[PDB]
Amino acid sequence: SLLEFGKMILEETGKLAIPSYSSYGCYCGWGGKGTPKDATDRCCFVHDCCYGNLPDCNPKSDRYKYKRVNGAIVCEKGTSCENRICECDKAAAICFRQNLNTYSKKYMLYPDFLCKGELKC
Numbered sequence: 663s664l665l666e667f668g669k670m671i672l673e674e675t676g677k678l679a680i681p682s683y684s685s686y687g688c689y690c691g692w693g694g695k696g697t698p699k700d701a702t703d704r705c706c707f708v709h710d711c712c713y714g715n716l717p718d719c720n721p722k723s724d725r726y727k728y729k730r731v732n733g734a735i736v737c738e739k740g741t742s743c744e745n746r747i748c749e750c751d752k753a754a755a756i757c758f759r760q761n762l763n764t765y766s767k768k769y770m771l772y773p774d775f776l777c778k779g780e781l782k783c
Contacts, residue, residue: 663725664721666725666751667751670728670735670751670752671683671755671758674759675755675759681771682765682770683758685770685771685772686702686703686706687700687769687772687777688772688776688777689704689706689707689709689710690703691706694706694707695774695780696779696780697777699769700761700769701757701760701764702761702765702766703769704757705754705758708757709754711783712750713747714783715746716746720743724747726738727744735755737749737752
């Protein structure tokens with residue numbers, strides 16, 4: 663679920679998902695169009711694609727379980743949708759952590775009209 667994803671993000675990065683990531687660049691949060699602004703935004707592009715691969719799942723609301731094996735995220739067994747949603751969220755959280763070195767506050771609340779260009783999934 664979105665709340666679990668937000669907690670996973672905070673655990674990984676120390677940044678509150680809202681507002682550090684919920685309106686970032688062209689792909690973090692609500693919609694998505696255009697060329698990702700930077701590595702962090704690309705994490706969100708891929709995460710959107712990841713959810714897009716699950717038609718019949720409800721990533722915003724469906725809850726999954728995971729644990730920590732030393733610092734590593736291990737998705738625990740639920741329904742197939744739960745497992746797949748968890749793997750999407752795990753990847754994005756790790757991706758945000760990997761790219762904290764280029765996170766830029768100037769991309770928070772990025773205006774929709776600047777999301778120029780195109781990308782397929």
